[PDB]
Design a protein around this ligand. Sequence first.
Ligand SMILES: Nc1nc(-c2cccc(Cl)c2)c(-c2ccc3ncccc3n2)s1
Length: 432
Amino acid sequence: TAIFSDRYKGQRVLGKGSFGEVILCKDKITGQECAVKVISKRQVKQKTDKESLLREVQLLKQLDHPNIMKLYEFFEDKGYFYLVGEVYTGGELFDEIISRKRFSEVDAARIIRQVLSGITYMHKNKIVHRDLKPENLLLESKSKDANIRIIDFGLSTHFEAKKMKDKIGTAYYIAPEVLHGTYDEKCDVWSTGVILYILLSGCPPFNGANEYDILKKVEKGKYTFELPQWKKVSESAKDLIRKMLTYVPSMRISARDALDHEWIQTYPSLDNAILNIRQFQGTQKLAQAALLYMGSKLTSQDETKELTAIFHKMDKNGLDRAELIEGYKELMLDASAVEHEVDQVLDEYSEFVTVAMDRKTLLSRERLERAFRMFDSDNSGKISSTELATIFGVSDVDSETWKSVLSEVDKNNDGEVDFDEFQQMLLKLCGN
Ligand SMILES: Nc1nc(-c2cccc(Cl)c2)c(-c2ccc3ncccc3n2)s1
């Protein structure tokens, strides 16, 4: 009965989440700001019936913990679900850590105590996450020492996630038992052990050249503390990771027993871990940016041709401000974006579409350039072919496919690419 549009108005895109986009919205009466995840029913399949979802959402709205995201409302119309919740402006935990000069075992324990606090509370209320990862750890405020909020706790039991643009950075943290189908709340302890391992080394315990190679390592479940970074880390931290990364879930420690472990109650600097976590986060974010870029090029290519056909059928006189605005509503807030587009583009409908979308292409190029620049930590202007293999590995582009495309852009490259070349390689990888 309740309609979303009759209560909230969109302000700006906050980013992307799992199962849909996150928009910053404002209540039309009280002005309260909210983060709204919009889930398209055509793009996302329901694991359970509509009765099971309403009951889990009802329970989730009544739960309250300082380390769990607050869900306020839930709406559904013919083609979408709207999860309305609280706004957390501090960003993702790992983005805060890469900006820090120093990071110690006390900072890591403080983080993991919060993550385990949220989990324990949620396990007492029989909610499992399943997809606990760094992206689902948002900081309440801009500051470094701020409260961590776990996002999407309980969504996975009712929504199915395949697209490589999504699914990037998920294989590192997934519990082996989730892969074979029989899992319970202990899967969330495994994921926290993986995150804890990365916080104290900067490297995942189960790693590989591509998604499937990572999953092979996870499934075998063997890892080591046999890297130079672990020498400067205490045996009590190694003992907790061992208990949390125990293969058989019945033998694995509970989230509650992890809070009461010697390490969390008891707790220098881990410099090599910050350098590795910078590189890990840089690689993750560039691969993501590369996939978003290729996605935006096909979306714009589709939208330009679909909008041209609509504006051509609208053209009776062999152009018109009211007609140009009318065309945008046919392919679908949309009128206000058109009013801002027509005023800026002007400052022929064929010349309009090119400028209106070349503005959108420049915006798409600059987001990719930011992630390239941030990945290029030594400011060389280039990334090696080895760095490309890692990048194209995490974005699941086949080795022979990107190496072929590279020789087509520049035949006399010496195992390095500049930004323009990288951009040119991605355009060729999406039929452009
Ligand atoms: N995976 C993600 N899902 C959400 C989300 C949003 C609303 C409802 C629900 Cl159930 C989940 C995210 C979120 C939450 C707050 C945020 N606040 C400021 C910036 C980005 C934010 N993103 S990330």
